[PDB]
Amino acid sequence: VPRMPMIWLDLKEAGDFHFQPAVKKFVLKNYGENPEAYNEELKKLELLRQNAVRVPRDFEGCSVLRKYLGQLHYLQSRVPMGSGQEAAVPVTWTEIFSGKSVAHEDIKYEQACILYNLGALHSMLGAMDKRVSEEGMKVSCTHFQCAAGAFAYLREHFPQAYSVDMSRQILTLNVNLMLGQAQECLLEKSMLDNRKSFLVARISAQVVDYYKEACRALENPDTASLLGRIQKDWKKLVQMKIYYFAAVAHLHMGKQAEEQQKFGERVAYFQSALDKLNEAIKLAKGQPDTVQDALRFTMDVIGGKYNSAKKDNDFIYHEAVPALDTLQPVKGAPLVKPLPVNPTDPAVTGPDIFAKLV
Amino acid sequence: EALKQLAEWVS
């Protein structure tokens, strides 16, 4: 089946973070040393920052953002630059939806934006691949789970939002959207393997559940005014995907009834899948050719399998076609997660830049 | 059967 396009998030634009004067001033008082013994280490971290905030849009930009995020934790453990702390300096980033600069004298604000950009870059890497190879499907699934993990970590360990693009209602939308796209990649994988029809139906039902939570978030008035046109572009794709994968789920439920020799049940599920897919086609008006190619392929599957099932039942089996309400819905199978973020993993961080400052 | 294969696949 042709693959649907994916949503990705833009990275935030960074401003100034003059940590050099503050760090040199704190080592002189508190640690009692000459600040100019740390010129080479302050240059290391600034170079690290300029490369983290002007990060290349590939797989290793993630290891650069991770390294800088971990070294920020190292620095804060040795120099107090948090909110209200002795050596805090202004941290400036641009809020994504307004384009306005927001400043906080808190190093945890810098970590929040770096972590936000980690998840956003993962969402770009997940959405860039064509997912034609099983290996491309696996990297997209991991990327979306990593994006969900960064936004989830950001929503828990920074419970007060430094800017509205990182509030908990927006972050929850981001996690639910990234988990739906991760689950969607796994749905592609389970269908390429030719797994059992019931299992595929459970996986596809979970894709619907994630996108329904993202849709409910996008229908909240607070979210729509902040995202602007973005809310209208995302939801048009999400609403259509809700019905598309609802059709995919019932198509595989009808294939299970076929294996169960319930041919009256099989017509009912195929009829439901075709109705939901026709709804997806109607909601997909104006969508790019990637979306339409996927819907045209799926209709060839569902359309022919519905006609053949009704023909077999009307002429061979004569089994009662149940209404859709009388048969139990498909329970989703959540197999994807926000994958955890360890900021201070020494393997991704390398040595502590300021290890000498004791 | 298959879910133990896909659970490792997802990570």
Author numbering:
A (entry chain A): 4 to 361
B (entry chain E): 8 to 18
Original paper wording:
His domain protein tyrosine phosphatase (HD-PTP/PTPN23) is a tumor suppressor that regulates mitogenic receptor downregulation, endocytic recycling, and cell migration (Chen et al., 2012, Doyotte et al., 2008, Kharitidi et al., 2015, Lee et al., 2007, Ma et al., 2015, Manteghi et al., 2016). Crystallographic structures of the HD-PTPBro1 domain in complex with the relevant binding regions of SARA, endofin, and all three human CHMP4 isoforms reveal that SARA and endofin binding is similar to that of CHMP4 at the conserved site, but critically extends into a neighboring specific pocket unique to HD-PTP. Altogether, this study identifies the Bro1 domain of HD-PTP as a highly selective interaction hub that coordinates recruitment of endosomal signaling adaptors versus MVB sorting and receptor degradation.
Interestingly, CHMP4 peptides showed much lower affinity to HD-PTPBro1 compared with the SARA/endofin peptides, with KD values of 132 ± 7 μM for CHMP4A, 85 ± 2 μM for CHMP4B, and 89 ± 1 μM for CHMP4C. For the CHMP4 peptides only 11 residues are clearly visible in the electron density maps, whereas 20 residues are visible for the SARA and endofin peptides. All three CHMP4 peptides bind in the same way across helices H5, H6, and H7 of HD-PTPBro1, and form similar van der Waals contacts with a number of conserved residues, including the critical L202/I206 pair. The main CHMP4 anchoring residues are a Leu and a Trp present in all three isoforms (L217 and W220 in CHMP4A and CHMP4B, L228/W231 in CHMP4C), which contact HD-PTPBro1 residues L189, L202, and I206 from two hydrophobic pockets between H5 and H6 and H6 and H7. The mode of binding of CHMP4 peptides to HD-PTPBro1 is similar to that reported for the complexes of CHMP4 peptides with Alix or Brox Bro1 domains (McCullough et al., 2008, Mu et al., 2012). Thus, binding of CHMP4A/B/C to HD-PTPBro1 requires rearrangement of these side chains to accommodate the critical CHMP4 Leu and Trp residues. Overall, the SARA/endofin peptides form an extensive binding interface that encompasses both the CHMP4 site and the S site, resulting in accessible buried surface in HD-PTPBro1 ranging from 762 to 780 Å2, compared with 468 to 473 Å2 for the CHMP4 peptides.
